[PDB]
Amino acid sequence: VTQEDIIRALASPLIKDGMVDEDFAEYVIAREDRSPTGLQAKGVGVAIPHTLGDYVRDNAISVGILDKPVNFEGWYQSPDPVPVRVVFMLAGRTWDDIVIVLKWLKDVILDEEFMKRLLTMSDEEIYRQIYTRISKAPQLSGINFKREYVRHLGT
Amino acid sequence: SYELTQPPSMSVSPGQTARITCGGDNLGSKYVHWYQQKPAQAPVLVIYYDSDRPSGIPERFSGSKSGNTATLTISGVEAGDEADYYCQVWDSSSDHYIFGAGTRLTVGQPKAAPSVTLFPPSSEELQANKATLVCLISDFYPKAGVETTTPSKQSNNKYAASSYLSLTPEQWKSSCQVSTVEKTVAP
Amino acid sequence: QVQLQESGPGLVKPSETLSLTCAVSGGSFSSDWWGWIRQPPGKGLEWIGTIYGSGGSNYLNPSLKSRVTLSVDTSKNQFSLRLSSVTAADTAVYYCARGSGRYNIWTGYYTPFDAFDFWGRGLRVTVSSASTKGPSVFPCLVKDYFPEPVTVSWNSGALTSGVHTFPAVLQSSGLYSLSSVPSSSLGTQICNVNHKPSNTKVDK
Numbered sequence: 121v122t123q124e125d126i127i128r129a130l131a132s133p134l135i136k137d138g139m140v141d142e143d144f145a146e147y148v149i150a151r152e153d154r155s156p157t158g159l160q161a162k163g164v165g166v167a168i169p170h171t172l173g174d175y176v177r178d179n180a181i182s183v184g185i186l187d188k189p190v191n192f193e194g195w196y197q198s199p200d201p202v203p204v205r206v207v208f209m210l211a212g213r214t215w216d217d218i219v220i221v222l223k224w225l226k227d228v229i230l231d232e233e234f235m236k237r238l239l240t241m242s243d244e245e246i247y248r249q250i251y252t253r254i255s256k257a258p259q260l261s262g263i264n265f266k267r268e269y270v271r272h273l274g275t
Numbered sequence: 276s277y278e279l280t281q282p283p284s285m286s287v288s289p290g291q292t293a294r295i296t297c298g299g300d301n302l303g304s305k306y307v308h309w310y311q312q313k314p315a316q317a318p319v320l321v322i323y324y325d326s327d328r329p330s331g332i333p334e335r336f337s338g339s340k341s342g343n344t345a346t347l348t349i350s351g352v353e354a355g356d357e358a359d360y361y362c363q364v365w366d367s368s369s370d371h372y373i374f375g376a377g378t379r380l381t382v383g384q385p386k387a388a389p390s391v392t393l394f395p396p397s398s399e400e401l402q403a404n405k406a407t408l409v410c411l412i413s414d415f416y417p418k419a420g421v422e423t424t425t426p427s428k429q430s431n432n433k434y435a436a437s438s439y440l441s442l443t444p445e446q447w448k449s450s451c452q453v454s455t456v457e458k459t460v461a462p
Numbered sequence: 463q464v465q466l467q468e469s470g471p472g473l474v475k476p477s478e479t480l481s482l483t484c485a486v487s488g489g490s491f492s493s494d495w496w497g498w499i500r501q502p503p504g505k506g507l508e509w510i511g512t513i514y515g516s517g518g519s520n521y522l523n524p525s526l527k528s529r530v531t532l533s534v535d536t537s538k539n540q541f542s543l544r545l546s547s548v549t550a551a552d553t554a555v556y557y558c559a560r561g562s563g564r565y566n567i568w569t570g571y572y573t574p575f576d577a578f579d580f581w582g583r584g585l586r587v588t589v590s591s592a593s594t595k596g597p598s599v600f601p602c603l604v605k606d607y608f609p610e611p612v613t614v615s616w617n618s619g620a621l622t623s624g625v626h627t628f629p630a631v632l633q634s635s636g637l638y639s640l641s642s643v644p645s646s647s648l649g650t651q652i653c654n655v656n657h658k659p660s661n662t663k664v665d666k
Binding site: 147151154171196 | 519
Binding site for chain 3: 306308310317318319320323324329361363365369370371372374375376377392394397398399400407409411413422423424425427429435436437439
């Protein structure tokens with residue numbers, strides 16, 4: 121199980137609702153290979169694939185919780201892949217669009233309790249947790265988040 | 276309205292170091308990137324993000340930052356290291372990317388001997404009722420109807436220029452004015 | 463090994479529009495920021511603007527904001543420049559470059575490109591009302607051409623040594639001319655010249 125599989129999986133709910141084109145996977149993949157987004161966190165690795173293009177139809181976040189850690193290469197240049205178990209796929213129209221959610225997510229990763237609940241809760245429990253967090257943030261209005269954007273992918 | 280101040284030019288005899296500098300407001304809180312451009316060439320990034328160095332750039336090239344000022348450092352100065360050196364910065368306020376004014380180089384260095392070649396008109400040119408003499412200075416480090424070019428540097432770290440002499444075909448049916456070498460033209 | 467080759471007219475009439483295009487072969491065109499920078503004759507470097515490879519995000523020069531538009535064709539690995547209402551001040555050399563960027567979350571630095579790591583060759587653009595003239599080729603001798611530049615390949619490219627092409631001379635007519643540089647080869651072992659503005663090739 122490779123990074124591509126997790127990217128191509130978290131992008132499926134987006135290409136269904138028609139928030140991204142059918143080649144969006146090819147583009148996050150292609151962007152992950154140029155600017156990897158894998159990060160070290162409390163007990164888990166986090167990754168934040170994203171694509172930013174004219175092929176994005178609306179901004180959306182697709183959250184995936186993996187079961188056995190997958191190696192994403194490191195956002196910051198290090199010799200070691202980050203064993204990622206939590207993935208936040210981003211799709212956005214402009215770079216300001218992504219840089220807003222990007223900042224938002226940093227505080228999510230600095231919220232150890234928020235991050236642990238994710239590892240040990242059901243897909244509906246997760247949706248309501250983030251949807252609430254997205255509601256509290258007015259900078260994040262216009263972002264698309266639905267119950268089908270949460271997925272417990274397994275290796 | 277933001278500008279990057281760097282010395283117009285700098286001289287250094289081979290074997291020394293170099294310390295091309297660049298100044299600007301809050302240049303400590305800004306990333307400085309150094310570019311090197313040689314004659315007839317596109318720039319080449321030699322130092323990016325203050326201190327870090329691109330792949331394929333010799334370690335004799337280095338950069339540093341000091342308060343509101345940054346400085347390149349070209350150790351192991353060679354003769355090929357001649358170029359104009361630029362610095363760039365982003366500057367959040369006034370979202371443009373400023374390139375520095377440029378710090379010319381090429382040091383003195385060993386002197387050389389000039390070289391000269393001259394050519395006559397061609398068969399088709401005279402048949403076309405025109406005539407031109409081409410006097411070519413293939414190296415030179417450091418009577419009307421005449422055109423001459425400026426001193427243009429060459430890839431061999433030397434200089435070139437080409438003087439031309441345009442005349443009529445009838446004038447030809449009736450010798451380069453550069454030590455000082457010369458040729459001669461005969462039909 | 464990202465390779466960028468520029469393309470465009472090289473002569474444009476004043477008060478007209480400059481259209482240029484850049485073709486990337488490096489490979490990762492969707493994911494990088496590509497830009498233009500120009501250098502007027504004998505002067506420094508001016509950044510014009512830059513556009514995201516996948517489309518969607520532009521950054522332009524505030525003072526040329528009004529005169530410049532930018533486009534991408536991701537499928538063809540090309541991006542283009544359009545400069546409007548052109549003046550003899552826009553007479554410059556125009557490069558295309560890939561962007562360098564260092565994003566740090568935890569810090570908040572997200573400037574999309576900070577430095578220009580790979581550059582292209584450089585296309586010469588001349589703003590002039592004069593028209594384009596094809597050079598006259600003579601035994602090599604190239605005279606009476608405009609605008610710059612011309613191509614010098616000897617032996618269709620086979621001879622790549624012992625040849626020093628000479629920088630050109632501006633004839634007082636407003637025209638350009640130049641020339642380019644064994645004892646036993648004699649009979650055994652032609653100059654090839656292209657003027658792109660005039661679209662004339664002479665392999666003689």
